[PDB]
């Protein structure tokens, strides 16, 4: 009725602070894993060159 309740009350602020940091840590890691991915596609000039060769030019 008295003792355990008081010590639970004492624990609340630190646990709240640590869990807020843990949540921020998760969000930070989520952002850090994001990285714009640029793709490379076959240049059309080689297509235009193969087109020309096929013509027997």
Partner 1 sequence: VGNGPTFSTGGECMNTCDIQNAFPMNDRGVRSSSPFQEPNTAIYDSYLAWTYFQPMDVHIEKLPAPEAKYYQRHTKKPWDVSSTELT
Partner 2 sequence: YKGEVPPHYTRKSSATIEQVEKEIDALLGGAEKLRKTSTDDQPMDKLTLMERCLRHALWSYHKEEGRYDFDQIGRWVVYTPEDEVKLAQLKREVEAKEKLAALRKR
Partner 3 sequence: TLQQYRRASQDKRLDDLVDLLERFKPVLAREAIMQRLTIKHLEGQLGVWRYMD
Q: Give me the residues that bind partner 1 (CB under 8 A), please.
A: 9-10, 12-14, 16-17
Q: What is the DSSP letter of 47?
A: H
Q: Work out whether 38 is an interface residue with partner 2 (CB under 8 A).
A: yes
In the complex, least distance from residue 52 CB atom to partner 3, rounded to whole angstroms = 21
| Both structure tokens of 51 | 């087109």
Interatomic CA distance for residues 21 and 27, integer angstroms: 10
Q: Work out whether 45 is an interface residue with partner 2 (CB under 8 A).
A: no
3-state SS class at 11: helix
Q: What is the DSSP letter of 33?
A: T
Q: Work out whether 34 is an interface residue with partner 2 (CB under 8 A).
A: yes
Binding-site ranges for partner 2 (CB under 8 A): 27, 30-31, 34, 36-39, 42
């Amino acid at each position: 009725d008295i003792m355990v309740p008081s010590f639970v009350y004492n624990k609340l602020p630190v646990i709240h602070f640590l869990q807020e940091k843990r949540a921020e840590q998760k969000l930070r890691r989520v952002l850090d894993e994001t990285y714009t991915e640029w793709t490379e596609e076959l240049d059309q000039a080689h297509v235009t060159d193969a087109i020309t060769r096929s013509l027997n030019i």
